Design a protein around this ligand. Structure first.
Ligand SMILES: O=C(N[C@H]1CCC[C@H]1NC(=O)c1ccc(Cl)s1)c1ccc(-n2ccccc2=O)cc1
Lengths: 52, 234
């Protein structure tokens, strides 16, 4: 299912290019080296509750 | 908000509150970035001059985390009309940048295709606001949140006495007594995906509140993603 299969193993956005999974992140996040995890660049990344 | 629960410390950091010249909240909004707020177009009529307050969770007193911001530019969609309530969306550019901290942080804007396929197909969404706790009553002095199920589009079209356009969607309960209410308009509707909350809707309207056979109507954000983008530039 690619993207339809557990979001293609992506942390956030999932797209299917060349019949393969391609992950991407929202503004303020950086795609990790595995090309699946999304890493925040600041202390208050969007979408995250400030629980600390 | 009718029913639901109190937003605990840090749980709804993207909530904004429009306050009138009397420092009283009439509508809600969602934080999009340090300079931008998302809200409803019909809220821009609930008052002439208004400001935006962030980091507030209890209206009665001042904890020390709140912040009032002045609106520099008001950007209401030019297709809105109180006759239909279609295109109920607006963007506010603040004069000063919001400083993120506890209870103050933006909600994520998702990509259209992914959002409609992955977020809006989830079971529920989250709505919040300082609105009325009962169809008839005073606004709430505490910020509240409520998990509302996505309603079948056909089911809601059937239950409504007004036309549900493609710029709206329904969320809520058929009979259960939980729903948004007067005062939560323009507020946020977000959807959670892997501990990350994305903005999926804007509190727009309802026939009464929590009424049986009636749901909540929200502006469909995925329908305005480009509009939102342009607005955050001009
Ligand atoms: O103010 C309103 N209702 C009030 C009911 C009790 C207080 C408010 N209830 C709400 O604000 C919400 C309840 C639940 C949510 Cl979610 S928002 C309204 C109801 C209907 C329409 N309307 C829609 C389409 C076309 C024409 C039209 O008049 C516009 C505004």
């Amino acid at each position: 299912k690619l993207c339809s299969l557990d979001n293609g193993d992506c942390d956030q956005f999932c797209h299917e290019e060349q019949n393969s999974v391609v992950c991407s992140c929202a503004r303020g996040y950086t795609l990790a080296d595995n090309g699946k995890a999304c890493i925040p660049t600041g202390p208050y990344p969007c979408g995250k509750q400030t629980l600390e | 908000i009718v029913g639901g629960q109190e937003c605990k410390d840090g749980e709804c950091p993207w909530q904004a509150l429009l306050i009138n010249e009397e420092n009283e909240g009439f509508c809600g909004g969602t934080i999009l970035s340090e300079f931008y707020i998302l809200t409803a177009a019909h809220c821009l009529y609930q008052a002439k001059r208004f400001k935006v307050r962030v980091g507030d969770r209890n209206t009665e007193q001042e904890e020390g985390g709140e912040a009032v911001h002045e609106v520099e530019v008001v950007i209401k969609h030019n297709r809105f009309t109180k006759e239909t309530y279609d295109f109920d969306i607006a963007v506010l550019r603040l004069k000063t940048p919001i400083t993120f901290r506890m209870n103050v942080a933006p909600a994520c804007l998702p990509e259209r295709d992914w959002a409609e396929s992955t977020l809006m197909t989830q079971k529920t969404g989250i709505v919040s606001g300082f609105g009325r706790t009962h169809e008839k009553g005073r606004q709430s002095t505490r910020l509240k949140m409520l998990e509302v199920p996505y309603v079948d589009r056909n089911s809601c079209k059937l239950s409504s006495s007004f036309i549900i356009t493609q710029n709206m969607f329904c969320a809520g309960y058929d009979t259960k007594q939980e729903d948004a209410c007067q005062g939560d308009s323009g507020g946020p509707h977000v959807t959670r995906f892997k501990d990350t909350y994305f903005v999926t809707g804007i509190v727009s309207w309802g026939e009464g509140c929590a009424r049986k056979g009636k749901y909540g109507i929200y502006t469909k954000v995925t329908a305005f993603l480009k509009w939102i983008d342009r607005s955050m530039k001009t």
